[PDB]
Amino acid sequence: AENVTGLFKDCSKIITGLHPTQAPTHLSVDIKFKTEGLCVDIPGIPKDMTYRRLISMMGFKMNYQVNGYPNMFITREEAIRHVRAWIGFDVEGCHATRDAVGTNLPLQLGFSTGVNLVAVPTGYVDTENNTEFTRVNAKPPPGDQFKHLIPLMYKGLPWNVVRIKIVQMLSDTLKGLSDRVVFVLWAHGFELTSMKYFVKIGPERTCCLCDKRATCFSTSSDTYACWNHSVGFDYVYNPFMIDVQQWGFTGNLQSNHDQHCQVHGNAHVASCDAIMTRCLAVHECFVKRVDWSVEYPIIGDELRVNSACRKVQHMVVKSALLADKFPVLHDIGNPKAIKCVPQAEVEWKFYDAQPCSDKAYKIEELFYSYATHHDKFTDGVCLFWNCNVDRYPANAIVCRFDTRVLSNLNLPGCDGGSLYVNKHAFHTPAFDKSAFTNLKQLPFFYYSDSPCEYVPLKSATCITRCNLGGAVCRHHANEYRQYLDAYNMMISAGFSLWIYKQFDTYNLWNTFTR
Amino acid sequence: GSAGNATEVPANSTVLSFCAFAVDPAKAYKDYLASGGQPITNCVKMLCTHTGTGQAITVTPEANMDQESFGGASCCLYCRCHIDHPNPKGFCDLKGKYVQIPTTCANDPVGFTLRNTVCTVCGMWKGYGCSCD
Ligand SMILES: C[S@@+](CC[C@H](N)C(=O)[O-])C[C@H]1O[C@@H](n2cnc3c(N)ncnc32)[C@H](O)[C@@H]1O
Ligand SMILES: [Mg+2]
Ligand SMILES: [Zn+2]
Ligand SMILES: [Zn+2]
Ligand SMILES: [Zn+2]
Ligand SMILES: [Zn+2]
Numbered sequence: 001a002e003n004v005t006g007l008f009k010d011c012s013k014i015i016t017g018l019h020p021t022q023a024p025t026h027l028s029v030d031i032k033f034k035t036e037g038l039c040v041d042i043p044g045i046p047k048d049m050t051y052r053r054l055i056s057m058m059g060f061k062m063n064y065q066v067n068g069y070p071n072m073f074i075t076r077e078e079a080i081r082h083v084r085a086w087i088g089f090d091v092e093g094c095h096a097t098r099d100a101v102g103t104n105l106p107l108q109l110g111f112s113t114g115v116n117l118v119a120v121p122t123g124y125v126d127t128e129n130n131t132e133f134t135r136v137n138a139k140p141p142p143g144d145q146f147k148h149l150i151p152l153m154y155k156g157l158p159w160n161v162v163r164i165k166i167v168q169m170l171s172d173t174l175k176g177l178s179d180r181v182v183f184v185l186w187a188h189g190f191e192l193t194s195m196k197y198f199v200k201i202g203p204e205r206t207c208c209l210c211d212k213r214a215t216c217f218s219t220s221s222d223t224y225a226c227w228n229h230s231v232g233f234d235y236v237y238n239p240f241m242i243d244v245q246q247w248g249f250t251g252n253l254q255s256n257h258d259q260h261c262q263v264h265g266n267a268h269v270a271s272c273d274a275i276m277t278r279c280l281a282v283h284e285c286f287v288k289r290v291d292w293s294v295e296y297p298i299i300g301d302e303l304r305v306n307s308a309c310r311k312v313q314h315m316v317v318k319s320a321l322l323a324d325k326f327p328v329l330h331d332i333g334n335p336k337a338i339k340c341v342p343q344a345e346v347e348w349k350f351y352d353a354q355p356c357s358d359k360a361y362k363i364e365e366l367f368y369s370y371a372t373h374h375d376k377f378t379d380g381v382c383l384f385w386n387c388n389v390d391r392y393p394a395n396a397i398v399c400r401f402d403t404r405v406l407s408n409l410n411l412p413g414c415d416g417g418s419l420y421v422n423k424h425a426f427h428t429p430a431f432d433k434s435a436f437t438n439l440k441q442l443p444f445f446y447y448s449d450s451p452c453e454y455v456p457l458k459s460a461t462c463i464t465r466c467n468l469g470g471a472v473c474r475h476h477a478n479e480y481r482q483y484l485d486a487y488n489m490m491i492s493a494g495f496s497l498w499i500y501k502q503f504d505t506y507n508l509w510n511t512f513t514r
Numbered sequence: 515g516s517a518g519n520a521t522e523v524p525a526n527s528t529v530l531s532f533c534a535f536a537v538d539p540a541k542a543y544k545d546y547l548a549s550g551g552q553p554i555t556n557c558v559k560m561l562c563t564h565t566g567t568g569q570a571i572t573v574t575p576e577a578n579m580d581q582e583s584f585g586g587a588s589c590c591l592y593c594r595c596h597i598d599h600p601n602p603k604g605f606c607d608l609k610g611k612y613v614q615i616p617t618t619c620a621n622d623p624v625g626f627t628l629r630n631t632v633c634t635v636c637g638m639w640k641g642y643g644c645s646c647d
Contacts, residue, residue, distance in 0.1 A: 007522035007597060017519075020585040022609050024594055026558045029585070038561040039585065041575050047610060056518065062531035066549045094619075095605055102518030124596050129605045131596040201535040202542070217537060237537070477582050494522050 005059055011100040012053040019047030021126060040100045053126045054100035054136060060192045068203035072240055075359070080243045080285055080294060084411040084427065085178035087170065088112035088242075088274035089185045091194040092149060094121050097138035105138050106194040109162070110270025112184070112278045112412070115169055118152045119162045126301055133159075148268055152508060163198035163234050167216055170236070175228045176299065176408050179213055183241035186253045186277045192241075196231045240302055244281050256280055260287075263430075276386065279414035286419050286427040286512070289354055294424065296436030298364075302409060302422045305493045308486035311397065313340050313385055315483065316497065319447045320381065320397050323507035327379035332368050333387025381500065388428045391435040398498045400437065405494035442497035444479045445505055449512075457481070463508045523556050532555070534595045542629055553622035554594065558585035560612065568614065570632045570639050575612040582620045586613045589623045590631060616642055 004027065010017065016030045020039045021449065023029040033039045065071075065278045078085075085481045094107040107119040121138035126130055140149040153408045157165075163285040171182060185191045205214040207226030216225030217235040249256050260470040264276055323331070328347035332357055333340075335356045339348055355363040370390040382396045392398055403418035416430030446462035456472030465476045491497075515530075522530070529546055536542035549552060558581035566576030575583040584605045586608035587593045592600065599606050608627060615623050633647070640646075 003520045003524055004520035005524055005527060006516060006518060007530070008521045009516065010519040010521045011517075012519075019562070020558050021611055022586055023558055024596075025556050026588065026589055027521050027523070028519060029558055035561065040561045041612065043574060055521070059527075060531045060534075061527050062535070062552070064528045064532050064546070064549075066532075066545050066551075069542075102516050115537060126596065130599055131602075133598075196534065199535060200537045203538045217606050327528065388600045465558065484638070 005061075007058065007059040007061065009051055009055050009058070009102060011096065011102045012051075013100060014053065017048075017053065022047050022064055024126065029268040031361060041180055041297070044077075044220060048128065050128060051126075052099065054096055054103060055102035055124045055131070057124060057193050058103055059189070059197065059198050060085060064191070068200070070238060070240075072203060072238070074240050074242055074331050076242070076247065076285070076430060077183060079184075079281075080163055081296075081418070082178060082180060082182055082298070083421070085174060085180045085181060085182045085240070086112070086184050086278060086281065086411075087173070087181065088276070088278040089183045089191050090270050090277065091191050092266070092268070092270045092273075093190060093194075094138040094140055094153070096121065096123065096136050097139035100136070104190060104193070104385065105136065106190075106197065107138075107140075107149060107167070108273045109194060110272070111396065112271075112275050113169065113173055114271055117157065117165060117169075117271055117273050118155050119157050119159055121153070122159055122484075133147070141147050145268065152256050159197055159453060160234065160403050164232065165271045165445070167230070167236060171216070171230060171233075179227065181236065183239055184274075184281050185241060185243055186273070186275050186280075188243040188245075189243065197240070198234070199239055200237060202237065205237060232254040238418065242281075243253045244277055244284075247284065249280075253277065253280070261507070263415040278412070280485055281413075282427070283414045286413070286425065290426060291425060292424050296423065296425065298423065299408070304486075305409075305490060307397075308489045309493070309495065310340075311483070311486050312497075313376075313492055316499075317341055317383060317385075317397055318344075319445070319508055320499065322447075322511055324381070324502060326380040330367070330377045330380065330382040332384050332389075334363070334385075336483050337362050340383075386426075386495075389435070391432075391437060392439055392498070394438040395502075396439060396498070397501045398436075398499065399495055400431070400435075402494050402496050403428060405429055407494060410494065436498050438499040440501040440503075442499040442503075443505070444484070445508075446476075448476055448479060448484055449506055450475065452476060461505075463505070463512070465511075525552065526554055526556060529554050531646065533591065534597060539597060540600075541589060541594060543628065545624060547589075547622070547625065552605050554591075554624040557588035560584060568639065569637050571637065572612050572614070577614055580616055581614040584613050584615060586611045589594050589613045589615070589627045591624055591628055593622065598646055615637075622647050 016333050018028050019031050059170050090110055091106050092108040093104045105123055110116045121136050123136045140146050194265045195495050200217050205224040208223050210226045210229050212226055213421045214224035214237050215227045216230040216233040217237040218233045257279050257373055261279045321344055330349050332351045332412050334350045335352045336359050350363040351366040352363050353367045382393055384398045386399050410418040410420045417428055419427045446464050450465050452473040453475040456477050458470055465471045533539040533639045536596050560575045562575050562577045562583045568578050578585045579622050590608040593606055593609055619626050633644050635646045
């Protein structure tokens with residue numbers, strides 16, 4: 001007897017602390033004051049007038065239940081519900097060599113965002129009057145692999161700066177994306193410890209002069225801040241975090257990351273570590289395919305993009321059917337019947353890896369790979385609409401997401417692929433030209449077969465309902481305008497259209513014969 | 515590598531971790547008590563003559579048959595969690611002086627120092643009690 005933390009372990013090199021007053025604990029008061037499991041005041045042996053004792057912040061170990069106070073560690077489930085509130089977090093650190101030993105200071109912080117913030121080594125030092133938060137002498141870890149940390153000692157930066165820069169850097173990243181923060185970390189101990197600097201915690205609060213829950217806090221003048229409308233805010237009111245390693249991974253992080261994703265090589269920089277942590281969380285959760293019970297609220301204008309997406313789908317597959325008159329259509333990646341063109345003579349076959357249970361009688365359970373299936377559908381046309389695959393067959397109509405475009409919808413992923421979120425987040429592979437080698441790009445066009453009915457405009461590109469004249473026909477002239485807008489919307493949404501090369505704009509004209 | 519001197523027992527970990535991060539440490543503590551969590555222990559307890567003034571702040575331990583005596587710093591929450599003191603600049607009252615608590619209320623010495631204020635006239639606990647007012 002008895003066990004000790006050590007948390008707030010006294011790291012000073014002083015023998016013989018500490019007077020029973022100005023002693024934080026019974027554990028340290030000099031043996032001289034201790035008798036019979038107690039302490040006793042001896043006026044003769046004085047309390048120190050001046051002393052500086054480094055107190056270790058390591059081993060924070062916080063698990064607690066208080067009604068008004070939110071658990072800051074969350075279930076794997078709850079961590080999926082909020083994604084890209086996700087930020088990878090890892091802190092390289094330093095040891096205090098000179099006037100103290102046995103604690104680790106937070107030298108360099110890094111995030112899923114490319115940013116790295118380096119700080120002056122600082123710590124908490126107990127003194128006669130109070131506890132003070134101050135710069136401390138410190139040294140780099142011993143290893144030759146840690147040799148890269150040395151210069152960072154000098155470079156920067158005051159913590160009052162860093163904790164303010166941290167917020168803004170998180171602020172403009174998460175402003176539109178989420179209401180909160182979740183920290184994704186591999187081995188959580190030191191980052192929890194690092195968190196002590198820029199984080200204050202407490203019961204939930206609403207943004208000053210704003211409706212949404214408060215992410216940030218300001219010591220300057222007490223205030224509770226929104227993600228968007230905060231500025232000049234030092235502290236983060238209610239972060240969340242999840243320790244990936246808690247998930248039962250076998251080895252070290254790098255091994256597990258590199259197993260799946262090759263787009264991140266490793267430089268020991270804290271960021272490159274904090275990114276790797278995210279790939280794993282991403283991959284482990286989201287390369288499992290399309291759990292459909294998860295609802296992420298949307299902002300913004302995905303509904304428009306969603307409608308536009310389907311709208312343009314109908315147009316192109318209807319025409320492509322008209323023009324080249326395919327006997328059968330293989331629709332791959334259609335979990336539900338849902339014919340895009342409801343009425344067509346064509347044989348319509350559905351294929352899916354994860355067909356929806358009800359309405360699963362129509363669909364063949366299949367996983368498409370060009371290697372195996374290049375032979376297997378020779379007949380008619382194949383449709384992959386947002387079904388991302390091994391390179392596409394020569395006869396096809398495909399809509400694919402180009403991961404390279406950034407919009408608040410798509411988030412980084414593994415490897416080089418972006419995890420796309422409109423609803424029901426879909427992880428999609430990195431955009432690859434080689435995949436389209438059998439196809440050709442799809443030029444914009446409009447098709448309407450309808451009886452015809454603010455300034456009019458002439459479009460060379462379309463099949464107009466009437467081309468005999470100019471010919472601006474008030475129904476089409478307006479519909480063409482509205483369709484093109486919904487087409488330009490989804491092409492700006494990052495989607496790209498690819499068609500079999502046989503396809504020709506002309507052949508739609510012969511449908512205007514009589 | 516520790517490589518250091520351990521100042522704390524595990525039984526106080528969560529509470530101290532909790533109040534350290536909190537914006538209001540004082541509330542967090544009182545709240546934590548309500549939740550059924552244990553009051554902070556390990557505070558320094560004085561073997562005393564128990565004859566002396568009942569005064570709360572004393573340069574040497576002064577106790578009563580009713581009171582018990584504690585080293586001030588160990589009874590102060592802000593000293594204990596190593597966070598800034600509510601006095602704007604910068605100083606703690608209890609550190610460097612011995613502090614006395616009613617034995618019945620002595621179970622949670624840390625909170626007692628938070629809840630109450632000493633009367634300026636006799637320099638003694640208010641209500642626990644005071645001839646003043
Ligand atoms: C393609 S996405 C959503 C796009 C959908 N086709 C649309 O246009 O609404 C979801 C479906 O893709 C299918 N999928 C993805 N990869 C597949 C593959 N290699 N083979 C077959 N189906 C695949 C899944 O089985 C899943 O049901
Ligand atoms: Mg780490
Ligand atoms: Zn706001
Ligand atoms: Zn990666
Ligand atoms: Zn104090
Ligand atoms: Zn009085």
